Coordinates of C-alpha atoms and ligand atoms in Angstrom, one line a residue:
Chain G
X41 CA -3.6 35.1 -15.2
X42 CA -5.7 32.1 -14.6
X43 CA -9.2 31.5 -13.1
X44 CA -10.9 30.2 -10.4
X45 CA -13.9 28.3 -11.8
X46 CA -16.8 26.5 -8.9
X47 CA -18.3 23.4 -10.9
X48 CA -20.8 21.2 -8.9
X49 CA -23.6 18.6 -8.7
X50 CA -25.6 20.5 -6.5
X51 CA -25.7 23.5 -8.7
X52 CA -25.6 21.8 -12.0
X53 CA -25.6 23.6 -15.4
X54 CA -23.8 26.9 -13.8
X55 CA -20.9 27.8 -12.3
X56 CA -18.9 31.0 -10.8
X57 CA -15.2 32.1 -11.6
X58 CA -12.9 34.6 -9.8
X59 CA -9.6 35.6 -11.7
X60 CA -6.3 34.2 -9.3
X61 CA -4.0 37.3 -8.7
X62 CA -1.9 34.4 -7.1
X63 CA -1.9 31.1 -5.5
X64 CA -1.3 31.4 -1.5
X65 CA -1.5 28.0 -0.5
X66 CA -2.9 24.3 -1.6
X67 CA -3.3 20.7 0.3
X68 CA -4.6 17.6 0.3
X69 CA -5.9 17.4 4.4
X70 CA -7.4 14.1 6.3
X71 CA -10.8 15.5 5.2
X72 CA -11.3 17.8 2.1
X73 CA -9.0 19.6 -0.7
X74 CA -7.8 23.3 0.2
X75 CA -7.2 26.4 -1.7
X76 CA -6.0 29.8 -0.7
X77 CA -5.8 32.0 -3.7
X78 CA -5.3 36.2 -3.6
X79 CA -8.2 36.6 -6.1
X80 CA -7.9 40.2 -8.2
X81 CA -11.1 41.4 -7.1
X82 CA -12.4 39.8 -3.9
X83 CA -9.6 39.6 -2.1
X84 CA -8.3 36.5 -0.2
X85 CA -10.7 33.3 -1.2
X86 CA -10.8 30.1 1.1
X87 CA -11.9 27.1 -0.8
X88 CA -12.4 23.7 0.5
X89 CA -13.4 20.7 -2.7
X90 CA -13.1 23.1 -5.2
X91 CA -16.4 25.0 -3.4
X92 CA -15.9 28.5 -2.2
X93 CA -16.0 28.8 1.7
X94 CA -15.6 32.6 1.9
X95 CA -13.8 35.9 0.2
X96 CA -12.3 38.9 2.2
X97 CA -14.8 41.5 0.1
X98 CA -18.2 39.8 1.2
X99 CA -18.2 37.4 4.3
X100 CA -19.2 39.9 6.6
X101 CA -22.9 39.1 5.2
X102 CA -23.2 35.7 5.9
X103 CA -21.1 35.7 9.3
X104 CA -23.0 39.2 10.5
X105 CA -26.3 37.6 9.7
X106 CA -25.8 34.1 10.8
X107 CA -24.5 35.8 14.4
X108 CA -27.0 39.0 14.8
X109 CA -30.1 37.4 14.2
X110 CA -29.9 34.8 17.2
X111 CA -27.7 36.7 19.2
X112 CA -30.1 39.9 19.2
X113 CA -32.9 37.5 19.9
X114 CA -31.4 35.5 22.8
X115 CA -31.8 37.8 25.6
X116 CA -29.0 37.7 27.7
X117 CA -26.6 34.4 26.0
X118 CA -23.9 33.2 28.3
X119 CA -22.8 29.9 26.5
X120 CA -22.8 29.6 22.3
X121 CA -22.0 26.9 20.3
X122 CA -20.3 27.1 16.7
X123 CA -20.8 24.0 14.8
X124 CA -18.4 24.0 11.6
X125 CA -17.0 27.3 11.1
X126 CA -13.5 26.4 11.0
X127 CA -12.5 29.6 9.2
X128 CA -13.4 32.0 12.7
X129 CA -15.8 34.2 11.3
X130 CA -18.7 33.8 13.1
X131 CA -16.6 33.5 16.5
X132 CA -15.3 37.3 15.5
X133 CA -19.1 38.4 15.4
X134 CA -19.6 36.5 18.7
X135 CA -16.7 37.8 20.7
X136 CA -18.5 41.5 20.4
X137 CA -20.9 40.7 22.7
X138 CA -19.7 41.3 26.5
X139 CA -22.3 38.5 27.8
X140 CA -21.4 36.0 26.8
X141 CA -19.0 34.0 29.2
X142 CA -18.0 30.9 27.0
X143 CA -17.9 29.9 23.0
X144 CA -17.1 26.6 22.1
X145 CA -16.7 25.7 18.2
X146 CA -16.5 22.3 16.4
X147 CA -14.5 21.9 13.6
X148 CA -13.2 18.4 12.3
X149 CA -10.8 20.0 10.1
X150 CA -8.0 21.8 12.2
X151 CA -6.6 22.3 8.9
X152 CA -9.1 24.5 8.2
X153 CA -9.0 26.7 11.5
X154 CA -4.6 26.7 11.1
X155 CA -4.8 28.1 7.4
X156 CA -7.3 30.8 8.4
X157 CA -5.0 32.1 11.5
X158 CA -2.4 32.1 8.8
X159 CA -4.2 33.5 5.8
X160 CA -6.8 35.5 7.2
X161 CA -6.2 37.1 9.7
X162 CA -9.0 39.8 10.0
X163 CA -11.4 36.6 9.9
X164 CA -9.6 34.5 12.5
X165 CA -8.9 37.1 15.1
X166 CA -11.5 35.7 17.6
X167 CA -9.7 32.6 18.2
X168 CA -7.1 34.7 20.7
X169 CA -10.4 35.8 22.9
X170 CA -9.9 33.5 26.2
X171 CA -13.5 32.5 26.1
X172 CA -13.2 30.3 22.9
X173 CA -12.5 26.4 23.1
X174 CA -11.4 24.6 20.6
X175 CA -12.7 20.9 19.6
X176 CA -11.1 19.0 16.7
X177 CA -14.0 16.8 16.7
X178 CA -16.8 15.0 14.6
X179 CA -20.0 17.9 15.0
X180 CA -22.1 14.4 15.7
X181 CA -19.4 12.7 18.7
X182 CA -19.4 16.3 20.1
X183 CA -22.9 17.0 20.5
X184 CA -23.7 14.0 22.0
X185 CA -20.7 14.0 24.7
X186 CA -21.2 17.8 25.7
X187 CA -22.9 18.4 29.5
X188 CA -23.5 22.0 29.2
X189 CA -26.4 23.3 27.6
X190 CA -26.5 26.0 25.0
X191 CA -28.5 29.2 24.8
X192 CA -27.4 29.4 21.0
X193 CA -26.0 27.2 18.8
X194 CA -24.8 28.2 15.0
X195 CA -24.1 25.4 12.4
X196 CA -21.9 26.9 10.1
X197 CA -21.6 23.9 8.0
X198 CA -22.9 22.3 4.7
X209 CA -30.3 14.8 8.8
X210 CA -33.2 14.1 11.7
X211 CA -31.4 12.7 14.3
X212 CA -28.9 15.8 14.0
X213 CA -31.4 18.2 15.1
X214 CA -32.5 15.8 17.8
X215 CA -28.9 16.2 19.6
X216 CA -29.4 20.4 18.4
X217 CA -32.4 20.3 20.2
X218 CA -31.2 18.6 23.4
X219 CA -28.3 20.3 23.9
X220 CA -30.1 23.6 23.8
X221 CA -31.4 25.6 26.8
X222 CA -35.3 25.5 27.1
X223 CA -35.7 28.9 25.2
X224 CA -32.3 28.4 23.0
X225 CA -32.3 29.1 19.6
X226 CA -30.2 27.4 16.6
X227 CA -29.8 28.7 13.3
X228 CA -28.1 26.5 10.2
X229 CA -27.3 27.5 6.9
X230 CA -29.4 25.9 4.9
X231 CA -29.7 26.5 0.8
X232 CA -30.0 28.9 -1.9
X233 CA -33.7 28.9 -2.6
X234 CA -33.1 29.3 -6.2
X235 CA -32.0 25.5 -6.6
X236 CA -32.6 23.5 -3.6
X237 CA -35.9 24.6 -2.6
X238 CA -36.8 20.5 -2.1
X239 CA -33.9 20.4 0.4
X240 CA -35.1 23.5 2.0
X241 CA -38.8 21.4 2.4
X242 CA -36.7 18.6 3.9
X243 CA -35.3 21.0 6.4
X244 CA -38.0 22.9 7.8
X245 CA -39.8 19.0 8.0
X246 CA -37.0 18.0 10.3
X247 CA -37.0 21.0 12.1
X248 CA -40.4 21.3 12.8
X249 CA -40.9 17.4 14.4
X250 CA -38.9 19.2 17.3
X251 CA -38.8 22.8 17.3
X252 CA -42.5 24.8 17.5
X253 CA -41.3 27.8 15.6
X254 CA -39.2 27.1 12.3
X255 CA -38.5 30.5 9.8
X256 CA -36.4 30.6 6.8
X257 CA -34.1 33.9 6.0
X258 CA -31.9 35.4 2.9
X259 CA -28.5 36.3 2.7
X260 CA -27.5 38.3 0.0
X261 CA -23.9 37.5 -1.1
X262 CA -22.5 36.9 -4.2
X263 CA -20.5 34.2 -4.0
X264 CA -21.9 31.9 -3.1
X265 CA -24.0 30.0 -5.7
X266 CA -26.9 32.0 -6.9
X267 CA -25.6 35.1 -4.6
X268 CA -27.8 34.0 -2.0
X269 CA -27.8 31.3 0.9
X270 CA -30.8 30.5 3.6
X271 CA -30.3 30.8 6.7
X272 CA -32.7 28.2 8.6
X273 CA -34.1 29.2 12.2
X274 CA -35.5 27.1 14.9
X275 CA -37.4 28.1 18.4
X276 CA -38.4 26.3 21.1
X277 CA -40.4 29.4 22.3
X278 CA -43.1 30.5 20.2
X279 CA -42.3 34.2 19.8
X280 CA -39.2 32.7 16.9
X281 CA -36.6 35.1 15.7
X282 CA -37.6 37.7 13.1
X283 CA -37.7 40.4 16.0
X284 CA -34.9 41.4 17.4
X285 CA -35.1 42.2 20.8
X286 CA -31.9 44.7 21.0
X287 CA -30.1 47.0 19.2
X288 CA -26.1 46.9 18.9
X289 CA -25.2 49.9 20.0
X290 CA -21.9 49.6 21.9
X291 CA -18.7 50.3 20.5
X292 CA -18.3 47.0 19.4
X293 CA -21.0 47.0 16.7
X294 CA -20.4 50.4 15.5
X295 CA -18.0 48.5 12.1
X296 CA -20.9 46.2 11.3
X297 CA -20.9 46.6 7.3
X298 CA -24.7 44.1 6.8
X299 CA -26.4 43.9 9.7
X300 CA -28.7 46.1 11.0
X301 CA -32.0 46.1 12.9
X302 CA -34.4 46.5 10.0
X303 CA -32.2 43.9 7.4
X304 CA -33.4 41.2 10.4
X305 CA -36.9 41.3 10.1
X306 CA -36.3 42.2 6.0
X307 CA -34.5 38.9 5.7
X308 CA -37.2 37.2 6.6
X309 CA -39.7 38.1 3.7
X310 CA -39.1 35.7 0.8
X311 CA -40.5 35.8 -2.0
X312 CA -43.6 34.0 -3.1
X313 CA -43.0 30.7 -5.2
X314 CA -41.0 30.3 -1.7
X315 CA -43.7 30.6 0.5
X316 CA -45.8 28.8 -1.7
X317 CA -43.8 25.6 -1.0
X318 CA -43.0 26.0 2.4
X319 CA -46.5 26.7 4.3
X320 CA -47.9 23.8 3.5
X321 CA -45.5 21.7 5.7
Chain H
X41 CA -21.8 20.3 -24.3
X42 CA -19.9 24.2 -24.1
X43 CA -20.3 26.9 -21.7
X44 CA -21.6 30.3 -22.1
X45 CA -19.8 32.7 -19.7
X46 CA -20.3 36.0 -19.2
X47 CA -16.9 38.7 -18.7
X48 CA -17.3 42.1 -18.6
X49 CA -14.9 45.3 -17.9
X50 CA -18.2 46.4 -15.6
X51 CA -17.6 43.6 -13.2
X52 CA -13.6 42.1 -13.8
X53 CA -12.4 39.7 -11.9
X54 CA -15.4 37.6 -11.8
X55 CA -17.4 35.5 -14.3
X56 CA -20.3 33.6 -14.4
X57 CA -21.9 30.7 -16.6
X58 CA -24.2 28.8 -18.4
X59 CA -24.0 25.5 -19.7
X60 CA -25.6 25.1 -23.2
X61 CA -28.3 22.5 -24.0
X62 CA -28.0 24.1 -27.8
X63 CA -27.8 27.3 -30.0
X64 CA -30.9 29.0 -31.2
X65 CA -30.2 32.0 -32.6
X66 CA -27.1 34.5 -33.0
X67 CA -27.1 37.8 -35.3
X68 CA -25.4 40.8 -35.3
X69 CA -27.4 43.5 -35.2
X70 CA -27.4 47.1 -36.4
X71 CA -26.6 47.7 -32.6
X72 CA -25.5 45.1 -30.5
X73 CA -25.0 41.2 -31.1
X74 CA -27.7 39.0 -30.3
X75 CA -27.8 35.2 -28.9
X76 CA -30.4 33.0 -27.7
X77 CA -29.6 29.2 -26.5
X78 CA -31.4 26.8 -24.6
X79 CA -29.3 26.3 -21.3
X80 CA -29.6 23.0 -19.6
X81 CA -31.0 24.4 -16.2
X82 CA -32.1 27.8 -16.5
X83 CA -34.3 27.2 -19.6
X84 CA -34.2 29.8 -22.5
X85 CA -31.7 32.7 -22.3
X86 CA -31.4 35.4 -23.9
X87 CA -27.5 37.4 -24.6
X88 CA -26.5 41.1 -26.1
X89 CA -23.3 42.0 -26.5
X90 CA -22.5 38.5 -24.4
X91 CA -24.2 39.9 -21.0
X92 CA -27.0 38.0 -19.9
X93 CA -30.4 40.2 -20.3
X94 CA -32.4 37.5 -19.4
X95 CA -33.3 33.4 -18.5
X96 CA -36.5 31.7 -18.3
X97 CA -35.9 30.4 -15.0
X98 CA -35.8 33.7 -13.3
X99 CA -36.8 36.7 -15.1
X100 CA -39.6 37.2 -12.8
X101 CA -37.8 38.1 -10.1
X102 CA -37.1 41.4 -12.2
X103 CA -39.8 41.7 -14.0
X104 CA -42.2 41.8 -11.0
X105 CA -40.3 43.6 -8.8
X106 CA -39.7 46.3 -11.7
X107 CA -43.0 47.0 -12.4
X108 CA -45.3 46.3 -9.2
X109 CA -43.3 48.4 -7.0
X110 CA -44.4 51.2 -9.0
X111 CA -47.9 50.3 -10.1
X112 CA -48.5 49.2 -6.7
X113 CA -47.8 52.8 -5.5
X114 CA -49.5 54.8 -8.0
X115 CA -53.3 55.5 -7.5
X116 CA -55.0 54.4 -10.7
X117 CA -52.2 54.7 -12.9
X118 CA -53.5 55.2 -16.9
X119 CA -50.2 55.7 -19.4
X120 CA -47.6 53.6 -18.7
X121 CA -44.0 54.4 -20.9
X122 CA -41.4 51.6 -20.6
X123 CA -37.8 52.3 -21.9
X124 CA -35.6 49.8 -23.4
X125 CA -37.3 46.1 -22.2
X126 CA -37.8 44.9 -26.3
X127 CA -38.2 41.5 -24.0
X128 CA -41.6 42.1 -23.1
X129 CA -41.2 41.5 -19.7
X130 CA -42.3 44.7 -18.5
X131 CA -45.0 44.6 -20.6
X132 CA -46.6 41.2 -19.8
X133 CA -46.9 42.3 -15.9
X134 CA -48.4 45.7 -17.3
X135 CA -51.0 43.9 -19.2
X136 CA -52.5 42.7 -15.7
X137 CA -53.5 45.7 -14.9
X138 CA -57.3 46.5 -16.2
X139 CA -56.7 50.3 -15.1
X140 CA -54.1 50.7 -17.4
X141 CA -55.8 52.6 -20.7
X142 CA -51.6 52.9 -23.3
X143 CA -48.7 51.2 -22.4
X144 CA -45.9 52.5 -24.4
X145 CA -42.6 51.4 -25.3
X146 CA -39.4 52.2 -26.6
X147 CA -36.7 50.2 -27.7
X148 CA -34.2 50.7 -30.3
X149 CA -33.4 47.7 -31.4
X150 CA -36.5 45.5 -32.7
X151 CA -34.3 42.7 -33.3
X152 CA -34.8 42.3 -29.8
X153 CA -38.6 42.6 -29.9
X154 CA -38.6 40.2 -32.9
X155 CA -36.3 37.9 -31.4
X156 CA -38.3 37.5 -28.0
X157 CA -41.8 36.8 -30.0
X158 CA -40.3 34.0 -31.5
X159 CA -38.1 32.6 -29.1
X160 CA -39.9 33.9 -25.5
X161 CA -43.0 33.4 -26.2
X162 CA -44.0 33.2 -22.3
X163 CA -42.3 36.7 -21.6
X164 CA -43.2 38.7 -24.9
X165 CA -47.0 37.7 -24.9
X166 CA -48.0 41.3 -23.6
X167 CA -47.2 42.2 -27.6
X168 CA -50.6 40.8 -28.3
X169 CA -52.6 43.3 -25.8
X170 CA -54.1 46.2 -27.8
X171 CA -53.0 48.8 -25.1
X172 CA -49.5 48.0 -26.1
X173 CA -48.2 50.9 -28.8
X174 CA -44.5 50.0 -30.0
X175 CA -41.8 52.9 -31.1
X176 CA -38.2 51.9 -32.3
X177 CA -36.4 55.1 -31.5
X178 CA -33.6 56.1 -29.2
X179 CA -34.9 56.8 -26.0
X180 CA -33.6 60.6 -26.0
X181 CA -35.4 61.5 -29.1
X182 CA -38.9 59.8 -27.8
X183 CA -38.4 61.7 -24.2
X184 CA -38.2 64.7 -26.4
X185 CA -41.0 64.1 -28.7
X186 CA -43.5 62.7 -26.8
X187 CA -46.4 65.2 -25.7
X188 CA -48.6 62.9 -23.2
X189 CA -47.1 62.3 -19.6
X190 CA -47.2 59.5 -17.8
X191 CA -48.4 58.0 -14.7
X192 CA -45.1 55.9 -14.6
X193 CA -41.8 55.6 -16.7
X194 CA -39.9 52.3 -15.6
X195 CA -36.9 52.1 -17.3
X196 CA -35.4 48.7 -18.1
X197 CA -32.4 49.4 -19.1
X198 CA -28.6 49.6 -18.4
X209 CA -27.1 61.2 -17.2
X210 CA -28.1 64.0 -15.7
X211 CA -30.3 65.3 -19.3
X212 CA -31.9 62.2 -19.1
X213 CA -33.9 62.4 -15.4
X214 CA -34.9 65.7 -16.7
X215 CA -36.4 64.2 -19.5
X216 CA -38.4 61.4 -17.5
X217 CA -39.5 64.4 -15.0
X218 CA -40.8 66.1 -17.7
X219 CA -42.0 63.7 -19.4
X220 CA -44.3 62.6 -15.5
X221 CA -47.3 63.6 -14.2
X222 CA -47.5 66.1 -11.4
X223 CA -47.4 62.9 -9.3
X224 CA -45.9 60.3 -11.3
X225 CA -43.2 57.8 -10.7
X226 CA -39.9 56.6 -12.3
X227 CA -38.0 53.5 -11.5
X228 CA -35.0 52.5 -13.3
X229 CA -32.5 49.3 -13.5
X230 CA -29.6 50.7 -11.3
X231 CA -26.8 48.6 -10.6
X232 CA -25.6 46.0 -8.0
X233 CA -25.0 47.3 -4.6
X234 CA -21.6 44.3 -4.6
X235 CA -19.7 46.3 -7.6
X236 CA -20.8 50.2 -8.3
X237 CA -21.3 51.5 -4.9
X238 CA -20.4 54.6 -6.9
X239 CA -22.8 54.0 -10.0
X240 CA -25.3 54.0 -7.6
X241 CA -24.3 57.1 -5.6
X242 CA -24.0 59.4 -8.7
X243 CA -27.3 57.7 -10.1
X244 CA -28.9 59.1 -6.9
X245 CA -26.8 62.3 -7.1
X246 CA -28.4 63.0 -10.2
X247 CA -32.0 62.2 -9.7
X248 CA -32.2 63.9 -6.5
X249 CA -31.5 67.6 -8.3
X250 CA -34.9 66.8 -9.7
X251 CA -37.0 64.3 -8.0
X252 CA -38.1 65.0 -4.0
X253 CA -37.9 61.4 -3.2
X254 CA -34.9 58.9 -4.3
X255 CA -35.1 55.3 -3.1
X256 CA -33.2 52.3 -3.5
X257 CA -34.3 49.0 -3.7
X258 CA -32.6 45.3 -4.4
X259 CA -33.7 42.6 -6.0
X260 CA -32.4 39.0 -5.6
X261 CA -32.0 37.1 -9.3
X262 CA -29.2 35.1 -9.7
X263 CA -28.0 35.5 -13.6
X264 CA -27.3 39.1 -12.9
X265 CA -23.7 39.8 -11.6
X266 CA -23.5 39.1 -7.9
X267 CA -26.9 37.6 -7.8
X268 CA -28.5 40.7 -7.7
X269 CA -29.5 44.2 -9.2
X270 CA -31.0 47.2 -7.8
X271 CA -33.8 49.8 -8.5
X272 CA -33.7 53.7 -8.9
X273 CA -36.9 54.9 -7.6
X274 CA -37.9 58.4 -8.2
X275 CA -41.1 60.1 -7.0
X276 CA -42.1 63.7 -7.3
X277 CA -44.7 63.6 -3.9
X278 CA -43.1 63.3 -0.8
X279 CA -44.2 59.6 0.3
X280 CA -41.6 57.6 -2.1
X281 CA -42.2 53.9 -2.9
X282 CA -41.6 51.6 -0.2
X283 CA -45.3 51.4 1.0
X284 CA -47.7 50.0 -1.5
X285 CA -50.8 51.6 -1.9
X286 CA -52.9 48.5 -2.8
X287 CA -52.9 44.5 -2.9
X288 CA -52.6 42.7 -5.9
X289 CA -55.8 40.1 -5.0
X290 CA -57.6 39.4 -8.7
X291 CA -57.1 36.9 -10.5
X292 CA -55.1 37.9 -13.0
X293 CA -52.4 38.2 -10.0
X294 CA -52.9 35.3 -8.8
X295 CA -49.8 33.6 -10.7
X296 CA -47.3 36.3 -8.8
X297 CA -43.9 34.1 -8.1
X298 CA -41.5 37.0 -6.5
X299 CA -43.8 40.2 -5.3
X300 CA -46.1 40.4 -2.7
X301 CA -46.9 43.0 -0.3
X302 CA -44.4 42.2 2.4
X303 CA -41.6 42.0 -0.1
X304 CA -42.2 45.5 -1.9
X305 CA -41.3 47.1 1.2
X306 CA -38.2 44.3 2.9
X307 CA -36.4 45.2 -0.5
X308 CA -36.1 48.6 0.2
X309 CA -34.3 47.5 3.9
X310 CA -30.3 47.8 2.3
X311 CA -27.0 46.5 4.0
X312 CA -25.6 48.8 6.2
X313 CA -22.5 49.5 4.0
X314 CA -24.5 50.9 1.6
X315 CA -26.7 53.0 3.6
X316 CA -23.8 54.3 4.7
X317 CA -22.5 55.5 1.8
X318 CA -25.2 57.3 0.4
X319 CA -27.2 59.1 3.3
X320 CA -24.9 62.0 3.1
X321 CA -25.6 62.4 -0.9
Ligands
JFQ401 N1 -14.3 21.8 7.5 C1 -15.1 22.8 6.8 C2 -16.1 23.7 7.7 C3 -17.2 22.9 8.3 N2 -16.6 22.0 9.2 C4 -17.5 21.0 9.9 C5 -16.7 20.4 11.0 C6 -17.5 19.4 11.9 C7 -18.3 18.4 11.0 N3 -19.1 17.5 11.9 C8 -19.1 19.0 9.8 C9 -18.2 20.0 9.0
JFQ402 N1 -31.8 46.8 -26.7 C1 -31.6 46.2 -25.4 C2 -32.7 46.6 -24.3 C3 -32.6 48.0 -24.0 N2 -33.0 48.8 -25.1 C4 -32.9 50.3 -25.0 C5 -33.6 50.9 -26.2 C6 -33.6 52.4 -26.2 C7 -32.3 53.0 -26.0 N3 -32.4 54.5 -25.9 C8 -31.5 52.4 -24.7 C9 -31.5 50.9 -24.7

């Protein structure tokens, strides 16, 4: 059998491999190269420019964490926004909460979103929830057209005057989270982050995910407040039926994810 | 320029790897092969039996994790006894230490010992520290032989005989911790590791470590304690100066890494 191998310039000088059971699917879309592939250990793999979006044996960790930490913040979230995210996961973990009344996600690719309700269909499942609108749309165009405010808004998705339009179209205590780096190879784009972050938002934290593929088996997950109190505390605990499958998260993990280790620290208080 | 790449019946299906600046060294030794090459972004790293034991870039992330979880823990901790670690890793966070009276260690290969004084000359400097008493035996026959305890075994390294060994070979109060397995691949591993060590010791922890030339990014630690209060909660801060150049551990950290995913809790409170 072949492999799967991840080359690129942002993580020069290594690279990841899965071995391909078998092909699923391949195209060339308006926007980006995609690859469906049965791997023979990770199950179903989702790769978009030869860069690995998500496997069936780990994304829970990334979409559970991304989701639970704001929404257990938030107190009681009635409107969320998914910026990116084509793939559904994070829209699953959000359509467990009973609250909230409306979920809108961006995706420019629709590609993206028709080859996950194909392929994967345990990842893709919350696109059938009635609260969930759809928007084939340019994350930038969007956010600067919407007239609703949002209480949380997730950037599920590889700039300044971004987080300006985050900032605005969020509620005055809203909260966004973006993924944002593994800090064992972009801890100068992490710096860059937090600066733009912080010209707006008073309270700007940093957590780890632990999952292995992505590159390094980590990825940061970059928090911003408008209220002071931030979000390394949750303020609830999922206990409701809904929760009771979550396979990462849990209330401890939030606050753990949030202690980093100390050449980290070292380059980050100081901005 | 080539690529190393690292395959492995412990983790099929998956592969990762290194590009190479140049070649060092390569032997075969009378136990396992031996390579050392300059990679081109994770500095100097060091191969046996083609599985990555170590790189430049990150080893502290083990190292320090490794050995101040425990020495954190225990009071004034005199005899130290490291198994396997011929890199010196260990060892050069030991030497920090000016409670410490013997550290011993074991390895039974001292091509690896003689391979990282030449080659790692920033990770096998604790060689040089008086303390520091080397013994090129099989670890079995050194449990067996040895008649000092110690205050803390930590064994760096990849069987139920064996924790009886390191118990006997502890204090009334001392502490083992051992290299156990990513929590991504050997759910199992790790539930039989803490099968066996809880026949013996009262208190069996588990604790991850992120470092991202281990399989899945990560790798976990067996921690055994013969008092009741484990080793999550360190018992001191590490503020002289000969801390001061600390680039993973610190106090908030020794505890977050014991916080696990909730699939793996799961698996192994009922053990
Ligand atoms: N298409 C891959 C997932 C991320 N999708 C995003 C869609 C919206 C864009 N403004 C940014 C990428
Ligand atoms: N040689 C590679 C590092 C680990 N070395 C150990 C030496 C002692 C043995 N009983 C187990 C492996």
């Amino acid at each position: 059998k072949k492999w799967f191998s991840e080359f690129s310039i942002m993580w020069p000088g290594q690279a990841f491999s899965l071995k391909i059971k078998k092909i699923l699917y391949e195209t060339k879309s308006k926007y980006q190269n995609v690859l469906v592939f049965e791997s023979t250990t990770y199950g179903k793999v989702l790769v978009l420019d030869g860069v690995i979006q998500l496997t069936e044996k780990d994304e829970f960790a990334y979409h559970e964490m991304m989701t639970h930490v704001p929404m257990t913040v938030s107190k009681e979230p009635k409107n969320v926004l998914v910026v990116g995210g084509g793939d559904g996961g994070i829209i699953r973990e959000l359509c467990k909460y009973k609250s909230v009344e409306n979920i809108d996600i961006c995706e420019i690719d629709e590609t993206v979103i028709e080859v996950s309700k194909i392929y994967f269909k345990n990842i893709s499942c919350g696109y059938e929830d009635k609260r969930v609108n759809v928007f084939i749309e340019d994350a930038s165009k969007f956010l600067e057209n919407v007239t609703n405010t949002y209480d949380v808004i997730i950037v599920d998705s590889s700039n300044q005057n971004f987080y300006e339009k985050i900032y605005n179209a969020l509620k005055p205590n809203g909260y966004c989270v973006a993924q944002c780096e593994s800090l064992w190879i972009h801890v100068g784009t992490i710096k860059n982050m937090i600066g733009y972050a912080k010209k707006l938002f008073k309270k700007v934290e940093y957590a780890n995910i632990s999952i292995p593929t992505y590159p390094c088996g980590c990825i940061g997950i970059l928090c911003c407040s408008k209220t002071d109190t931030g979000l390394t505390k949750p303020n609830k605990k999922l206990e409701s039926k809904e929760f009771a499958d979550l396979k990462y998260y849990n209330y401890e993990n939030h606050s753990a994810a949030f202690k980093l280790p100390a050449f980290l620290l070292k380059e980050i208080e100081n901005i």
